[PDB]
């Protein structure tokens, strides 16, 4: 078991995870911080997001006004003083982010352009084009490379977090393309592995947004906040799920009413049968599709035979962002000394039930730095641990492998898969019922089962990607159990949830205005608790 | 892995030349080629137009002479150069190519200046 | 309705049993909108699970996807079938040394990427003062060259660097004369040593090969040629500094 | 140690047959040979018209074997495809922003053909009508 020394480390390599990366750097120069990521930094999914991302910026805006903005969409859900925060801190990373070379749009005078996006009263989603999410992700990343401390690890696939004695000491990980195991030690570790789009049998997330770390902490007794909350996108097309913008529609372009409209449709035999799940954009015109949708149309003509001037494209809602994540305080940091959980993988509880367009992104920039800074700080405060029971623990890891390579039984991961996404798509959807939703944690809890018949017939070890889906739909299948039963209990309707059933079809201030726990015991039942919001100058009503 | 401290390569100075002859025998070579290689030996002119007399007394006038050496030489340059370049592509082996090619450039230069040099 | 079947050929490879790659054959059902990363999923899944291959954004913004169809250098995710019917051969990234299946060692390009410092510098204006003033025109200056996916394609594809791995480039160059162009930036001399190597722009014969492939029309033959204009007229002040 | 084993396909001198952009290339960077044959012929007619006034009629009567006629041909037809090409690739070594637009090859190029074209003319002209 090779032994890698390093200050802090850093799990995922995305906009939030290399925010954290540079500021530890910046934060500590004689640093030695450990940057891995299953896949090389400028794949991360970050690199797929299209809008802009925000921040104050006009002079009739203000914070009072963003702020304000935030928690009317979390459904009051949000931990006011981190919104505070966030709001405060959105136009000083987007600055840096400017001054690091990000090719923000501009204004014919010269300056930063900014665009009205998430349907927010006044504009403040800065932007690059409508390849927003590439340029912040690859400035970023880019602008990483001039610092020695940050040592990369580039296709290292982690298996688990030390952890001894409530406190973070380090983590193993997977040389892919060597098939060995890796041994990293550090006494704070910073989390920020992406959502878990993919759980969905249609979603948008990139093929590793799997929400391995999400269900990485879970292991460790650590909860997942609000994880009840899905945000489905508009437009999704077959199987790809492949987005289709929302700018289109602001100007002519052609929502639980039609959500839910097409939704019961398929129950009295209204619904218009097409090959998926028309938007006509044929009116639409060169110049606006092509300045704000290059990408919409080339996945469209490809996928579907379809060009985006010239028919229309077949679609149906699909899973976009995981709001919940691992639970973290206003530093980040989570229950377990050592160990912050910055990016979407997170629940800084800055989006309470519902994320507001382009405040995502502007997130990462923003917790990510915060996220670096107090792990540098807690980092030198740590103090040695007991060897024997660290170094007892990766074994554990070895070990639990082996156990999992030598699994027989005959399933095939790949339809386990499948059928996982499937039951997500329909208990977990737009509109839950206690009925379905049921359903769907008796098929969830069913497949957990079955995941311990599954084999992994390859046994190769240079670059084995058989193994690791594997590993993958394992986190997969755990986080995807929390989801479930966090919104069969939530028995109200809130921002991302929305129920059908007598008595929860509203929001209830009363009696749900907290958040929600997801814990998964070694007996393998998932339980949840519930924690109270953070008021500060805006109360519900 | 990659050469922290890399040599300044030289090849701007041919690329240069290269890139004036190549630019000269786009835009000059075809007319040229289409009087002295065809419309001349088919004799497809008016009187004596392509005539050894009126055609020396073209060459001796100094726009004559200068014309002359850049039409010959400049496309020798962007020529020779690519057929030097041509043994990489095909990786072909060639004893000091580089000379060779350069080299047998550098020749008619002087040779082509000698030409017009004199009359 | 009913649905076509495709037979498709794959160059697999693996190093621990194979001593060379050699080809495969599998059978797989497919519509017009059926895409061939969609088809490598297929085949995993249900006709050999030890196939290997990089993916994830599945819309071609990620650039994992470089792989070689029919000797051309594309990106899966945006390749399909329906125009493959008369024979598929796909094989592992084009002048690059296969590791495993079409998962390619990487290593030289980021190398490359990273040798050009790839980021602005010597620009002492910090987040306080404000973003820097950038007008559309200065901004074109260099917004093309800035698309990059990082795919892998141009180099699959410039003969000059299949001759000359030495070569840092195509891309990488790019990537620099992107950053030269940026108004903002001032580390110009920081990024020329590399740039004027044997293996910098003067590797390049100008082919114009790799600006027909990318997937994203980022056009590097320009940059580059761009880059040599940019190099010769630095080979001459430095002809003339006895300073 | 390690369990890789990286297969390096093999380029070899032949590596330009197979795609036909390769091969267009080739003609491309192979146009240099008829441009240097013609600029040796040049030199034997710059020599040769020096040389003597006899010894340019079995100059001309050189030119004037069927052979050397064809080649000329050939050398004419490389000379265009030379020029056609070098005037498609040549704008690619400027930047230049019109109205926060890098214009592309299209305006440079139509330009480039025009001079081409006025040249000939002139050349022509100057060279019969006197
Ligand atoms: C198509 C699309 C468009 C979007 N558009 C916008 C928008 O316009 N504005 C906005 O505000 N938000 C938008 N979002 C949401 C937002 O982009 C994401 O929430 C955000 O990018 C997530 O970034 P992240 O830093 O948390 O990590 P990600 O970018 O998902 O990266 C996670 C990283 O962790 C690594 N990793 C994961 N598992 C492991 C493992 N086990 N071992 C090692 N490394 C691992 C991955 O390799 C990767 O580097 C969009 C999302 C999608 C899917
Ligand atoms: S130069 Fe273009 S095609 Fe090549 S890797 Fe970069 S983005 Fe891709
Ligand atoms: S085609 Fe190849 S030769 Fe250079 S100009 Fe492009 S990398
Ligand atoms: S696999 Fe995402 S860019 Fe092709």
Redesign the pocket.
Known sequence: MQTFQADLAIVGAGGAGLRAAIAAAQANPNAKIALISKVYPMRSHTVAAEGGSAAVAQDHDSFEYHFHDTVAGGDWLCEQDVVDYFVHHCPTEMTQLELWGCPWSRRPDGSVNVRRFGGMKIERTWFAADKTGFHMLHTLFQTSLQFPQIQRFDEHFVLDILVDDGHVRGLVAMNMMEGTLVQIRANAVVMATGGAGRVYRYNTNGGIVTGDGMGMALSHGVPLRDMEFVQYHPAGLPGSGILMTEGCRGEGGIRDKVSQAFWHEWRKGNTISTPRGYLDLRHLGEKKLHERLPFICELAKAYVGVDPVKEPIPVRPTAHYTMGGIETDQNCETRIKGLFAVGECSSVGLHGANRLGSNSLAELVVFGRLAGEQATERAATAGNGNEAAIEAQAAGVEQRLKDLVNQDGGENWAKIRDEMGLAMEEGCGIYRTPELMQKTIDKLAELQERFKRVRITDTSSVFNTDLLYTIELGHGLNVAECMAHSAMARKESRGAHQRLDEGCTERDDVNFLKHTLAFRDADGTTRLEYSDVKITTLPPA | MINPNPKRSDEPVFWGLFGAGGMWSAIIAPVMILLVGILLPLGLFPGDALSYERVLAFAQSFIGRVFLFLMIVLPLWCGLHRMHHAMHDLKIHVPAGKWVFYGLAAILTVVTLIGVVTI | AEMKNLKIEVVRYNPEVDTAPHSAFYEVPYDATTSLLDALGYIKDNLAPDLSYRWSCRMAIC?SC?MMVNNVPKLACKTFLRDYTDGMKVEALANFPIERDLVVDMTHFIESLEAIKPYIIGNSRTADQGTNIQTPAQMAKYHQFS?????????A?CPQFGLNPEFIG??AI?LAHRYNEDSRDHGKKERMAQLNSQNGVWSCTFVGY?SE????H?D?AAAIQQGKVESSKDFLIATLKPR | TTKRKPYVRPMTSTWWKKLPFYRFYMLREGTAVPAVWFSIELIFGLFALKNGPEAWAGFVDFLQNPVIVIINLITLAAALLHTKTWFELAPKAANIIVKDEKMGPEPIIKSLWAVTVVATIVILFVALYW
Do not use: D, R, S
């Open positions: 650039g470089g698309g990059c996916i990082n795919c892998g394609l141009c180099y594809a195509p891309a790019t790799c492939v990318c997937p994203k980022v590097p």
